[PDB]
Amino acid sequence: NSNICEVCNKWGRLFCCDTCPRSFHEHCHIPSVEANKNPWSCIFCRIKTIQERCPESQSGHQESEVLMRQMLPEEQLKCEFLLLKVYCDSKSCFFASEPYYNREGSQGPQKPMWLNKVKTSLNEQMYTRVEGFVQDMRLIFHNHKEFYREDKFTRLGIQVQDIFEKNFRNIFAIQETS
């Protein structure tokens, strides 16, 4: 097994996957690492199992169809994984905790959003469809773009949103287009 957390790349109190070599801090894994369960399989293993049980699940899909899916256990897991993939980028630190807005020439967003809030919402099963989760995620980056205007700090929103969007397309097998 790895000696660093797969998500934050730091050592510490790590839990090890029994079916692959990754390791996780307790609250870096999503959902949080489960109390008992030997063997334990991490979210990367559980996602790979889904694909292996249903190979045709990798054929291309339309985004509009994916967004209307109900949050049944397999969609729930996919959204948790996608969230996790965003936390794996170090620039997600800018979007993890609750922001505040006091900048000359800008007004704060009407509906603030941040990654820990989405994490909690997922955990408390507050999304009924994929669309709910995806809307909140995109809201994070949109609010950032709008608030930071022409400051070059806006680019952080672009970069982290690109990580989201690529992983979204991969995890939900969205039909490739030009």
Provide the binding-site residues for Zn ion, judged by CB under 5 A.
Answer: 5, 7-8, 17, 20, 25, 28, 42, 44-45, 54
Nearer to Zn ion, 42 or 134 (CB): 42
Place of tokens 């905790």: 97
Nearer to Zn ion, 92 or 143 (CB): 92
* Dist. CA 96–CA 178, nearest whole Å: 32
Nearer to Zn ion, 45 or 174 (CB): 45
Shortest distance (Å) from residue 55 CB to Zn ion: 6
Shortest distance (Å) from residue 76 CB to Zn ion: 18
Shortest distance (Å) from residue 135 CB to Zn ion: 27
- How much helix, strand and coil, in percent to the nearest 5, is found in the chain? 50, 5, 45
Shortest distance (Å) from residue 82 CB to Zn ion: 17
Nearer to Zn ion, 4 or 174 (CB): 4
Under 8 Å between Cβ of 41 and 33: no
* Dist. CA 128–CA 152, nearest whole Å: 36
Answer left, alpha or beta for residue 102, where phi above 0 means left and psi between -120 and 50 means alpha.
Answer: beta
